[PDB]
């Protein structure tokens, strides 16, 4: 047999894999968290987008901190042997390293740990992708004119830079998700995932700017952040 190259994840398993979409819109009153208008638009876009990539999409809405954890645990214990990859999309309130259940927060690290190389072996060596639309703090960008590591093969696609707010439009959905779906829709059959994510960075960075009656929140910008510990190139085809 002719010479072979090994630069890309094997994405030709019988299944592309799960796409779990956690859509938190409505929060228990006691948390003091606002209702996240527009997030349903994000959830629908993602569902359709990842449907077309041939992912087995599971939408979950309005989950408690307990339900998020139990869900992630249960999913990490499924047999992923026939699956190429895993995708988990989190839409909620957040702070740095944290996303909100409807009744309180969960550590991102606690969610991702379920899928570590040593804790879910049917996903070992396969790409584990986490896409997070949530704040990472309260800063505003004013813009300017024989063994593998257990943390290997994780990619975290953050909506925003570390420490910063992330922006969501109540009508159109969040800047990040809408841009992400557009680029997946447009480039998933021709670009490796990092270059797709890089077009998402540019789209968000250049095409969006906030409008507010409050000068503190007006004319602000956003740059998403790619957190990659992938060891191969990922192509959805």
């Amino acid at each position: 047999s002719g010479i072979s190259l090994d630069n890309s994840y094997k994405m030709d398993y019988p299944e592309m894999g799960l796409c779990i979409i956690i859509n938190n819109k409505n929060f228990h009153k006691s948390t003091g968290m606002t209702s996240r208008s527009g997030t349903d638009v994000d959830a629908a876009n993602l569902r359709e987008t990842f449907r077309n990539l041939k992912y087995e999409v599971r939408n979950k809405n309005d989950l408690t901190r307990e339900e998020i954890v139990e869900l992630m645990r249960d999913v990490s214990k499924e047999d992923h042997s026939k699956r190429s990859s895993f995708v988990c999309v989190l839409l909620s309130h957040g702070e740095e390293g944290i996303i909100f259940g409807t009744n309180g927060p969960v550590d991102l690290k606690k969610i991702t740990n379920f899928f570590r190389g040593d804790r879910c072996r049917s996903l070992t060596g396969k790409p584990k992708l986490f896409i997070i639309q949530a704040c990472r703090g309260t800063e505003l960008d004013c813009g300017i004119e024989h063994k593998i590591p257990v943390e290997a093969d994780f990619l975290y696609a953050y909506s925003t830079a570390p420490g910063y707010y992330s922006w969501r439009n109540s009508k159109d959905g969040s800047w990040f998700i809408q841009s992400l779906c557009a680029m997946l829709k447009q480039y998933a059959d021709k670009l490796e995932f990092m270059h797709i994510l890089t077009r998402v960075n540019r789209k968000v960075a250049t095409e969006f700017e906030s409008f507010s009656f409050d000068a503190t929140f007006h004319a602000k910008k956003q740059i998403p952040c790619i957190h990659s510990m992938l060891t191969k190139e990922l192509y959805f085809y």
Binding site: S92, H93, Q133, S166, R168
Partner: peptide, 4 residues
């Protein structure tokens, strides 16, 4: 426009 709102923040998360």
């Amino acid at each position: 426009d709102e923040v998360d």
